[PDB]
Design a protein around this ligand. Sequence first.
Ligand SMILES: [Zn+2]
Length: 207
Amino acid sequence: GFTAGLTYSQLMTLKDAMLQLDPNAKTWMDIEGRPEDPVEIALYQPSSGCYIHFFREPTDLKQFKQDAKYSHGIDVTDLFATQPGLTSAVIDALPRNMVITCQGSDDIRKLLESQGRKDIKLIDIALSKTDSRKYENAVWDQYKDLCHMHTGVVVEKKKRGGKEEITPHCALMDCIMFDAAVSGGLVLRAVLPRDMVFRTSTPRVVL
Ligand SMILES: [Zn+2]
């Protein structure tokens, strides 16, 4: 038995980082991509400002391209360097019986259950679409430097008329804006090291 993808030292570094979480603080979680094949993951604790944020290369390119066009605007080339096994290792390290808050619990439930974490309790805050996006503009304005990965034009599917571009959906900004909507208004600290979420790329001769 073992944790796939990460070597032991990486794993102990992650384990130590994860202990920066307050196990009882309100904790948001949000993902981009389907729960069976997620490409962006974020957890957020407003009280401390602690956030977990990382990415994953998709298994299904076809579905990913649809999601990029209509939801997240992420370019797969920026995902080539992601750390294999990171999603499983992070979720394994979440405190037992932790209470996690989300907007729509269905996808979060599926993802956690696929990791054998049925012990985690979910609160679906169930915001209207409109209510959930009240602080969208404000959040991107203040925190855009925390995520540069949404590079593609994202559009609304329309039956008629002109093209309509929309603001891309980011797991991290989602957490922040759903929390602002709940708290009636709007620093932050990264839990994970940058060299853990992305493997440093280096030159090679193709063999
Ligand atoms: Zn993002």
